[PDB]
Design an enzyme around this catalytic site. Sequence first.
Site, PDB file in Angstrom:
ATOM      1  N   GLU A  35       0.161   0.113   3.012  1.00  0.00           N
ATOM      2  CA  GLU A  35       0.064  -0.924   4.003  1.00  0.00           C
ATOM      3  C   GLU A  35       0.307  -0.310   5.373  1.00  0.00           C
ATOM      4  O   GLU A  35       1.261   0.439   5.547  1.00  0.00           O
ATOM      5  CB  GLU A  35       1.113  -2.036   3.741  1.00  0.00           C
ATOM      6  CG  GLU A  35       1.031  -2.695   2.358  1.00  0.00           C
ATOM      7  CD  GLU A  35       1.712  -4.062   2.274  1.00  0.00           C
ATOM      8  OE1 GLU A  35       1.046  -5.029   1.834  1.00  0.00           O
ATOM      9  OE2 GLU A  35       2.885  -4.189   2.657  1.00  0.00           O
ATOM     10  N   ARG A  51       2.361  -1.105  -7.297  1.00  0.00           N
ATOM     11  CA  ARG A  51       2.006  -2.142  -8.275  1.00  0.00           C
ATOM     12  C   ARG A  51       0.715  -2.807  -7.845  1.00  0.00           C
ATOM     13  O   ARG A  51       0.248  -2.607  -6.728  1.00  0.00           O
ATOM     14  CB  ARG A  51       3.096  -3.210  -8.363  1.00  0.00           C
ATOM     15  CG  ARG A  51       3.420  -3.799  -6.994  1.00  0.00           C
ATOM     16  CD  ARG A  51       4.022  -5.179  -7.051  1.00  0.00           C
ATOM     17  NE  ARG A  51       4.437  -5.607  -5.722  1.00  0.00           N
ATOM     18  CZ  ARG A  51       3.687  -6.321  -4.907  1.00  0.00           C
ATOM     19  NH1 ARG A  51       2.450  -6.672  -5.263  1.00  0.00           N
ATOM     20  NH2 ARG A  51       4.137  -6.637  -3.699  1.00  0.00           N
TER      21      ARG A  51
END
Lengths: 163, 82, 81
Positions: A35, A51
């Site tokens: 991110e 994940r």
Amino acid sequence: IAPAVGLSPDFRNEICEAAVKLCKNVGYVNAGTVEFLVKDDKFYFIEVNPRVQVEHTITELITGVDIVQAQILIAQGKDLHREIGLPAQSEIPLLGSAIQCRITTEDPQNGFLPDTGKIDTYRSPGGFGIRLDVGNAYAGYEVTPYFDSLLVKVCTFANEFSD
Amino acid sequence: REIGLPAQSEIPLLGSAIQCRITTEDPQNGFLPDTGKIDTYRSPGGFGIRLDVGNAYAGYEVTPYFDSLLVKVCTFANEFSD
Amino acid sequence: VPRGSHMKKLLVANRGEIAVRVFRACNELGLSTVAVYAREDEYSVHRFKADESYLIGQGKKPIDAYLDIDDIIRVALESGA
């Protein structure tokens, strides 16, 4: 949404390469997301989520790649290219665009507090360019206060963002 | 120019897709279409699934007057086997 | 590649839409599936989409039930996942 249709393809590729650089460095295994915050043609690492994510769905639609099947095959020791059958990076498809919304019981007229109670009617749409990944929503289901307020994830996809 | 389709050689060819029509034809009764009230109808989704529903919803009465289609299901993926 | 990476049966240590999403992928990969559910979540669609399912976290609050590491492992071992 996917891809980031408001940014130039070059700048997006740069962000993707930085993510790959980090993951190669640490020998990342299975699915993960990197991110960034982006501001005027610079980008800054904030986080890795090690994940699958709720919004994996839209990436699947624009690439043709089943991410969750890939996670499971990866855990079985399979090779991304030889066995799972993914192409090389530069051949990874980029097929139009996709949008995901989560429909929840949050009442926007009551400070987004999640409603509870019995679902009397639930009729879900379909057609071309629509994907649904349902949570707990069916006619007769009682929404409890114990869990999150998600009813159904809706994704749309098409060649053009505006469609 | 307006609809925005490419030239012939640029028309995409993206994996494969399969369509089945789910109907009320009873394969154990010579494919005669069943009629009566639908008590329960829960439709799947996920990646690679498209649904184009006819008349199937909980409480709908299937009549004998029309075709027996409940819902058209399509699947699609990179590989035919998937 | 770790020893024991071959799979016939998978358990999702979760609930709701993501559990159903995983079960779908499992089934398409020819794997059988196992759900866990808290008592208060007993009507959750994911409980019924799996090939087998097991109650977990008995007597705990519903969120703590899903965070119950040892009961989840217990189910995985008992079911042969």
